[PDB]
Amino acid sequence: APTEQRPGVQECYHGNGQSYRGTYSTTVTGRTCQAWSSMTPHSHSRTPEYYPNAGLIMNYCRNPDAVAAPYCYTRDPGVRWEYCNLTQCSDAE
């Protein structure tokens, strides 16, 4: 009889994560991402209007402008943006 929570498949990004369209929404330090369509607390230009094919919905980690890895602005006024707590798929190899 099982005594461990059902296995969870980790999310991971390929390449630099420009193709990432998963649901992860937490930064490397555990902070909660700000929604892309929100301008509070941080104003920015990474909007779905300006990156219409980048999947900039909700507050999911994304890489619309092809930086090093998926990222987000955070909801904390003291922290503008962070890379997300996401590993590269190739790490498990």
Curated annotation (Swiss-Prot):
Glycans are attached at residue 85. Disulfide bonds join 12-89, 33-72, 61-84. Residues 11-89 form the Kringle domain. Coiled coil: none annotated. N- and O-glycosylated. The N-glycans are complex biantennary structures present in either a mono- or disialylated state. The O-glycans are mostly (80%) represented by the monosialylated core type I structure, NeuNAcalpha2-3Galbeta1-3GalNAc, with smaller amounts of disialylated and non-sialylated O-glycans also detected. Disulfide-linked to apo-B100. Binds to fibronectin and decorin. Apo(a) is known to be proteolytically cleaved, leading to the formation of the so-called mini-Lp(a). Apo(a) fragments accumulate in atherosclerotic lesions, where they may promote thrombogenesis. O-glycosylation may limit the extent of proteolytic fragmentation. Homology with plasminogen kringles IV and V is thought to underlie the atherogenicity of the protein, because the fragments are competing with plasminogen for fibrin(ogen) binding. Apo(a) is the main constituent of lipoprotein(a) (Lp(a)). It has serine proteinase activity and is able of autoproteolysis. Inhibits tissue-type plasminogen activator 1. Lp(a) may be a ligand for megalin/Gp 330. Belongs to the peptidase S1 family. Plasminogen subfamily. This is Apolipoprotein(a). It comes from Homo sapiens. The chain holds residues 131 to 223 of 2040 of the full protein.
